[PDB]
């Protein structure tokens, strides 16, 4: 972990993942969000193989393009209660 930045983990495994940077943000200890910064895109695949080898059995990974579904459902319901305030 970085001391000045404890949301950030730096891989020191001396093979191929070396250099890679993760962050892990937990929320409702079922769900959580992982971010990978890799030096190429093959390291990202090598990493998700190794991860998927470790987790529990029913764990549904899903790549997030544009933020967590939790946030975007809020932003959509907001924009609807604004639209419907305006029609009121």
């Amino acid at each position: 972990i970085i001391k000045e930045f404890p949301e950030v983990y730096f891989c020191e495994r001396p093979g191929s993942f070396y250099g890679t940077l993760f962050t892990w943000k937990q929320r409702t200890p079922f769900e959580g969000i992982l971010i990978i910064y890799s030096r190429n895109q093959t390291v990202m695949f090598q990493c998700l193989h190794n991860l998927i080898r470790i987790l529990p059995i029913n764990c549904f990974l899903k790549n997030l393009k544009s933020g967590s579904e939790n946030f975007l459902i809020d932003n959509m319901a907001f924009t609807l209660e604004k639209e419907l305030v305006t029609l009121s």
């Binding site: 809020d74 319901a77 609807l80 209660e81 419907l84 029609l87 009121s88």
Partner: protein, 56 residues
């Protein structure tokens, strides 16, 4: 005319109270952030995006 506008207003303030109660459930982690909200909201959206804005 007026009956039209009031008909619209009621059709709106039902979907409004619907979305509001959905927001409360989100605030309190009632429905649990899963999916069923997403599909519901994108149906109150689809409902209104049909004859959106007649312009007079």
């Amino acid at each position: 005319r007026v009956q039209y506008l009031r008909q619209i207003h009621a059709n709106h303030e039902t979907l409004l109270r619907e979305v509001q109660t959905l927001r409360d459930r989100l605030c309190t982690e009632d429905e649990a952030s899963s999916c069923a909200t997403a599909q519901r909201l994108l149906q109150v959206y689809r409902q209104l995006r049909h004859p959106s804005l007649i312009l007079l």
